[PDB]
Amino acid sequence: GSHMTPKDDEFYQQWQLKYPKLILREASSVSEELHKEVQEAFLTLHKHGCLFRDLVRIQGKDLLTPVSRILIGNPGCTYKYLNTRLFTVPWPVKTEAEIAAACETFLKLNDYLQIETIQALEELAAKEKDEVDIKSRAAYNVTLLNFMDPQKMPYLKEEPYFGMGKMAVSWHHDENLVDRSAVAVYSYSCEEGRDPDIWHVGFKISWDIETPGLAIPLHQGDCYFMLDDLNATHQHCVLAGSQPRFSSTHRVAECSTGTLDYILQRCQLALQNVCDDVDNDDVSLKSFEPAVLKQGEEIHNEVEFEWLRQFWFQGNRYRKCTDWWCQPMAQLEALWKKMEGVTNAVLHEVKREGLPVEQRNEILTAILASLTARQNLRREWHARCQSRIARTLPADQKPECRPYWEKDDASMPLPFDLTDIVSELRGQLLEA
Ligand X SMILES: O=C(O)CCC(=O)C(=O)O
Among 30, 66, 141, 332, binds ligand A4F (CB under 6 A): 66
Alpha-carbon gap, residue 267 to 265, rounded angstroms:
5
If the CB atoms of residues 58 and 357 are measured against ligand A4F, the closer one turns out to be: 58
If the CB atoms of residues 41 and 201 are measured against ligand X, the closer one turns out to be: 201
169 touches ligand A4F by CB under 6 A? yes
Q: Which does 201 bind (CB under 5 to 8 A by kind): ligand A4F, ligand X, none?
A: ligand X
Among 2, 29, 151, 170, binds ligand A4F (CB under 6 A): 170
160 touches ligand A4F by CB under 6 A? no
Q: Which does 145 bind (CB under 5 to 8 A by kind): ligand X, ligand A4F, none?
A: none
If the CB atoms of residues 238 and 260 are measured against ligand X, the closer one turns out to be: 238
Beta pairing, strands 22-25 & 223-226: antiparallel
Q: Which residues contact 346 (CB under 8 A, 6 or more apart)?
A: 285, 288, 293, 296, 297, 363, 367
Burial class (CB in 10 A: 0-12, 13-18, 19+), 345: buried
Helix (H, G, I), strand (E, B) or coil at 223: strand
Question: Is 111 part of any known ligand binding site?
Answer: no
Alpha-carbon gap, residue 338 to 282, rounded angstroms:
10
Name 285's bridge partners: 274
Alpha-carbon gap, residue 239 to 237, rounded angstroms:
7
Question: Is 319 part of any known ligand binding site?
Answer: no
Minimal CA–CA distance to 413: which of 346, 364, 366? 346
Q: How far is the CB of 82 from ligand A4F (least distance, A)?
A: 6
| CA-based radius of gyration for the chain | 25
What phi and psi, each to the nearest 5 degrees, are found at residue 101?
-70, -45
Q: Which does 249 bind (CB under 5 to 8 A by kind): ligand X, ligand A4F, none?
A: ligand X
If the CB atoms of residues 88 and 249 are measured against ligand X, the closer one turns out to be: 249
206 touches ligand A4F by CB under 6 A? no
Question: Is 228 part of any known ligand binding site?
Answer: no
103 touches ligand X by CB under 6 A? no
72 touches ligand X by CB under 6 A? no
Could you give the C-alpha distances from 168 to 79, 150, 199, 224, 417, in angstroms and in order? 21, 8, 9, 17, 40
Question: Is 411 part of any known ligand binding site?
Answer: no
Q: Which does 65 bind (CB under 5 to 8 A by kind): ligand X, ligand A4F, none?
A: ligand A4F
315 touches ligand A4F by CB under 6 A? no
Could you give the C-alpha distances from 157 to 83, 170, 227, in angstroms and in order? 22, 9, 28
Could you give the C-alpha distances from 204 to 25, 41, 81, 171, 251, in angstroms and in order? 20, 32, 21, 8, 20
Question: Is 317 part of any known ligand binding site?
Answer: no
187 touches ligand X by CB under 6 A? yes
Taking CB under 6 A as the binding criterion, the range among 14-22, 61-69, 214-222, 279-287 that sits at the site for ligand A4F is 61-69
Among 34, 43, 63, 125, binds ligand A4F (CB under 6 A): 63
Query: CB–CB of 225/116 below 8 Å?
Result: yes
Q: How far is the CB of 277 from ligand X (least distance, A)?
A: 49
84 touches ligand A4F by CB under 6 A? no
Question: Is 112 part of any known ligand binding site?
Answer: no
Name 164's bridge partners: none
Q: Closest-CB residue for ligand X?
A: 247
Using CB under 6 A, which residues numbered 209 to 248 contact ligand X? 238, 247
What phi and psi, each to the nearest 5 degrees, are found at residue 148?
-145, 135
Among 249, 316, 343, 370, binds ligand X (CB under 6 A): 249
Q: Dihedral through CA 288, CA 291, CA 294, CA 300, nearest 10?
A: -80
Q: What is the DSSP code string of 35-91?
A: HHHHHHHHHHHHHTT--B--EEEETTEEEE-SSEEEEEESTTBEEEETTEEEEPEE-
Alpha-carbon gap, residue 84 to 298, rounded angstroms:
20
177 touches ligand X by CB under 6 A? no
If the CB atoms of residues 241 and 399 are measured against ligand X, the closer one turns out to be: 241
Q: Which does 367 bind (CB under 5 to 8 A by kind): ligand X, ligand A4F, none?
A: none
134 touches ligand X by CB under 6 A? no
Among 22, 45, 55, 67, binds ligand X (CB under 6 A): 67
Task: Give the residues lining the site for ligand X (CB under 6 A).
Answer: 67, 146, 169, 185, 187, 201, 238, 247, 249
Q: Annotated binding residues, as ranges?
A: 69, 81, 146, 172-175, 224, 236, 245-247, 249, 251
Task: Give the residues lining the site for ligand A4F (CB under 6 A).
Answer: 56, 58, 63, 65-67, 81, 169-170, 172
Q: Annotated binding residues for Fe cation, as ranges?
A: 172, 174, 236
